[PDB]
Amino acid sequence: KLEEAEKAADESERGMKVIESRAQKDEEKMEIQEIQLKEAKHIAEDADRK
Amino acid sequence: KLEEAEKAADESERGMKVIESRAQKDEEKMEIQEIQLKEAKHIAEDADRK
């Protein structure tokens, strides 16, 4: 049961590492896409201002 | 150790679910900011075009 509970922790932790690494990749990509959106929008606003 | 391993199962699994929720929020924000980046770039393209 300790192996099952610890394995549930270890496997859910690996699950977590993959989806936390995914959250990190999605977070970095969303920040990049958000900064690029802010800039593409700021370019659009700058182009609208122009 | 089993109680702590079950608490770790809960924390690594709750972690995995909080991270899955965060990864989903960051994935949706990634997907929302890339779709809206493509739109913000098309607005920049339209803003530059107009």
Residue numbers in the entry:
A (entry chain Q), B (entry chain P): 112 to 161
Paste lines from the article.
Sarcomeres are force-generating and load-bearing devices of muscles.
Hence, we merged multiple classes after modifying alignment parameters to obtain a structure of a native thin filament with the myosin double-head bound (STAR Methods). At this resolution, both myosin heads bind to the actin filament in a structurally identical manner with close interactions formed between actin subunits and myosin as well as tropomyosin. Compared with its conformation in the crystal structure, the lever arm is strongly kinked between the ELC and RLC binding regions (residues M801–E810), resulting in a bent conformation. Interestingly, the kink in the upper head is in the opposite direction compared to the one in the lower head, bringing the RLCs of the two heads in close proximity. Notably, the arrangement of the ELC/RLC of the lower head in our model resembles that in the “blocked” head of the off-state myosin while the upper head ELC/RLC is similar to the “free” head. Thus, the binding of myosin to the thin filament shifts tropomyosin from the C-state to the M-state position in the A-band, whereas tropomyosin remains in the C-state in the I-band. Our structure of the actomyosin complex shows the complete myosin double head in the rigor state in molecular detail and pinpoints the ELC/RLC interface as the position within myosin crucial for the structural rearrangement of the double head when bound to the thin filament.
